[PDB]
Amino acid sequence: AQNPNCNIMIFHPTKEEFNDFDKYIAYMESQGAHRAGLAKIIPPKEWKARETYDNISEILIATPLQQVASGRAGVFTQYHKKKKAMTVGEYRHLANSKKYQTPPHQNFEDLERKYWKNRIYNSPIYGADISGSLFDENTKQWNLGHLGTIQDLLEKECGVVIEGVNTPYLYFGMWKTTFAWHTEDMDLYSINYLHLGEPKTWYVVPPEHGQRLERLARELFPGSSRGCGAFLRHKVALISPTVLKENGIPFNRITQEAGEFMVTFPYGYHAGFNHGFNCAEAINFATPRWIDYGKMASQCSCGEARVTFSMDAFVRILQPERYDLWKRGQ
Numbered sequence: 001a002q003n004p005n006c007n008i009m010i011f012h013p014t015k016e017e018f019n020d021f022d023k024y025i026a027y028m029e030s031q032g033a034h035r036a037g038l039a040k041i042i043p044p045k046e047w048k049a050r051e052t053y054d055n056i057s058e059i060l061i062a063t064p065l066q067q068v069a070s071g072r073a074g075v076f077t078q079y080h081k082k083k084k085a086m087t088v089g090e091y092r093h094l095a096n097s098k099k100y101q102t103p104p105h106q107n108f109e110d111l112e113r114k115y116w117k118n119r120i121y122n123s124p125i126y127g128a129d130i131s132g133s134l135f136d137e138n139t140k141q142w143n144l145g146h147l148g149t150i151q152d153l154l155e156k157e158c159g160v161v162i163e164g165v166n167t168p169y170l171y172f173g174m175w176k177t178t179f180a181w182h183t184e185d186m187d188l189y190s191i192n193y194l195h196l197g198e199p200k201t202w203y204v205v206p207p208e209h210g211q212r213l214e215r216l217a218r219e220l221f222p223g224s225s226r227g228c229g230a231f232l233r234h235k236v237a238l239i240s241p242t243v244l245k246e247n248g249i250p251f252n253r254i255t256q257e258a259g260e261f262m263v264t265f266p267y268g269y270h271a272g273f274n275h276g277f278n279c280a281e282a283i284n285f286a287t288p289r290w291i292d293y294g295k296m297a298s299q300c301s302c303g304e305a306r307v308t309f310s311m312d313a314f315v316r317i318l319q320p321e322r323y324d325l326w327k328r329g330q
């Protein structure tokens with residue numbers, strides 16, 4: 001078996017290998033990449049997402065989110081407080097202000113130490129989940145707005161035609177903006193391109209060990225666990241690498257820099273943070289190997305994890321026994 005220790009693998013496709021997206025995902029899996037839950041893909045030197053980022057300041061962040069923490073430095077939740085709309089230009093200025101800017105630091109490891117020491121004492125503002133794309137329409141390779149849809153994948157694999165659409169999202173980040181521990185909706189894949197700016201550090205648990213993380217989370221967030229059998233779906237819980245190590249949870253870490261893609265694999269729990277002002281684009285996708293994960297994915301039915309209407313058909317077809325209860329939650 002390839003990659004038995006579940007290490008995060010880094011790939012350097014040639015321009016020829018970058019033509020056929022599905023084929024390259026399958027290639028990475030043939031090398032065991034999925035065992036880690038996360039892979040990095042460095043595009044060929046000839047490729048670009050768009051010509052420049054000089055013209056993006058007028059994008060609107062209609063509902064910036066202030067990420068307010070509670071708990072202890074290494075075990076905390078965050079809630080999102082809505083703020084007034086701002087443009088990307090205004091957001092960049094805010095990110096670079098003395099209150100919010102990245103502190104002096106020696107290297108990525110020093111910055112990581114500062115993040116876990118101090119994150120809870122600040123409330124950064126995140127411009128997350130903005131429907132849109134920054135890929136040029138003429139970019140033909142790895143354009144996240146031109147991938148095969150999950151609806152077409154399900155139809156091709158299972159013969160069922162379903163409603164729903166699948167479009168990318170933009171994320172504008174600043175120092176300390178945080179993504180909580182989660183898997184994707186229906187345990188889908190995700191792909192993530194860091195268009196510009198400062199890095200994003202990722203933590204990931206191998207899919208084969210996801211239940212270990214779930215068990216620890218139930219111990220560490222006992223009230224939340226009583227409220228919902230899939231509370232990690234709420235995307236609010238953080239556990240530091242130190243706490244994971246103390247509890248024997250298998251995980252890996254890596255930092256993504258501008259110009260790099262990250263793929264998360266079905267049932268790969270991940271979390272992380274932004275180093276400073278940046279912009280990422282991401283979308284969920286499926287392959288034939290996803291179907292059996294989608295069939296088995298846990299669901300939140302407590303009300304908290306409201307999601308896109310495109311997930312209706314996925315639950316309805318893949319999880320008919322669970323559908324009525326999940327729908328009540330929506």
Ligand SMILES: Cc1ccc(/C=N/NC(=O)Cc2nn[nH]n2)cc1
Binds near residue numbers: 054096101198275
């Ligand atoms: C197009 C474009 C490309 C790169 C950037 C980088 N910006 N880097 C910071 O702003 C550093 C910082 N972030 N928070 N505190 N300091 C901006 C625009």
Ligand SMILES: [Cl-]
Binds near residue numbers: 103114115
């Ligand atoms: Cl700090």
Ligand code: NA
Binds near residue numbers: 006007251252
């Ligand atoms: Na490891």
Ligand code: NI
Binds near residue numbers: 182184190264270
């Ligand atoms: Ni994710």
Ligand SMILES: [Zn+2]
Binds near residue numbers: 233303304
């Ligand atoms: Zn729930």
